Design a protein around this nucleic acid. Sequence first.
DNA 1: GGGGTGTGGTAG
DNA 2: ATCGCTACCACACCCC
Length: 438
Amino acid sequence: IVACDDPDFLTSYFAHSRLHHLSAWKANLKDKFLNENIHKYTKITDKDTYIIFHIDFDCFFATVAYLCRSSSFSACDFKRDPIVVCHGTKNSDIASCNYVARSYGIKNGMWVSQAEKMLPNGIKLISLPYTFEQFQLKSEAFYSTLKRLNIFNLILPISIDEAVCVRIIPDNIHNTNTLNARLCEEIRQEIFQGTNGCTVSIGCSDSLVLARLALKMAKPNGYNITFKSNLSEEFWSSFKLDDLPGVGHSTLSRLESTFDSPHSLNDLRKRYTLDALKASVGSKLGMKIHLALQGQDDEESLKILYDPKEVLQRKSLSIDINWGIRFKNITQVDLFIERGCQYLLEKLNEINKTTSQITLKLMRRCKDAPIEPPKYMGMGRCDSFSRSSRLGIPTNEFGIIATEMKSLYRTLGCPPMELRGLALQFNKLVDVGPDNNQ
DNA sequence: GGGGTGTGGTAG
DNA sequence: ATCGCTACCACACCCC
Ligand SMILES: Nc1ncnc2c1ncn2[C@H]1C[C@H](O)[C@@H](COP(=O)(O)OP(=O)(O)OP(=O)(O)O)O1
Ligand SMILES: [Ca+2]
Ligand SMILES: [Ca+2]
Ligand SMILES: [Ca+2]
């Protein structure tokens, strides 16, 4: 039990937080891409022709947590039991669940107590603990396999368990689906072997957006090849609106309110007009969804193909702690800001950078919300407040940054006992080169 | 056109 | 108990 006023809190929270791990793993994968390719341009151009293989472990955490589960939990079958990965017993997030559990309607992000109610009396919910180190070792095997194949002009990391692999098809060369299905089946089999029993699915197409939908269609433990030329009403009628990239819960609600609750991408595409779409969800997102409904990528999503090094370059750096924040006085808040600043500066120094703009953001208990929320140590219902500050010259100096961060906190007027969450952000970073003279 | 701010949204 | 992170894109409204 490490409390937020304990010097070890940040270490212990990050050690347990799957969302921290996902974000740290992604950041390390992007920096490794930059280093591996530091002397390899490997350029893709608008005139070039390519195929995308979008590869993703099926229920990654649940599959690995099961394969490596301790003897305390020997009594469960992956193919017949509803398995979830989570920390606790009641208001604890399901990090991952297996397709059996999903068959009952259970979803990642659900609380355990909610997913228990969805099980007909008789079947038992099996909760496995996280196995963070093994998640990363299986991932290592995965990215190693992908590299060893020497069949992709570009291997873009998406997350610990997900990558977008680009193969250039030269104008002279003739591609067949015979070749694609075999590349698909090789990848799936090598990864199954290299990871001791983990399965991936694969979407294969000639746009990023379609490969993504093809991969959704292929799950679980399969692969799907759907090119622009293969599009059909049958295909579109198989997807929900929030299967589209960029359509999260708020965009879904606006789409359902605007276009009379479509229930498939076929409904949406038979009903929309571009302008009504941009009116409902925004101009750029509107155009993106419009092009997506043709199977086509937008300008922003193509940039990762044309200049992946610019895209994967880190432009800001931050920490967010919105769980376990219970402080009594301004002294302990200041100490915590200081610990956060030191952590962020250690990271900033590891990447040889300075920052010229910082932000403090906080979560303050809603005036009518309970002091202790439903979730143990949760932030509960909160109001967000944020303030930023431009520095004089770029810096990595703790005295400048931590003092300004503590000043920013004071300007937001949040009593320490009402504090439920803090983010510390370095919004602009500057390169440190060999010449640091004035 | 540029830059400025604080907020909202998405994603594994 | 329980570990509700974090990068980056977009927008609204603001300065001349
Ligand atoms: N909040 C979260 N959002 C997404 N993934 C999360 C989250 N918390 C934990 N995870 C885990 C679930 C996975 O094991 C891993 C990668 O996420 P993701 O690929 O979306 O899910 P998944 O592999 O369990 O299911 P799917 O087969 O649908 O991809 O991260
Ligand atoms: Ca996955
Ligand atoms: Ca994934
Ligand atoms: Ca989506």
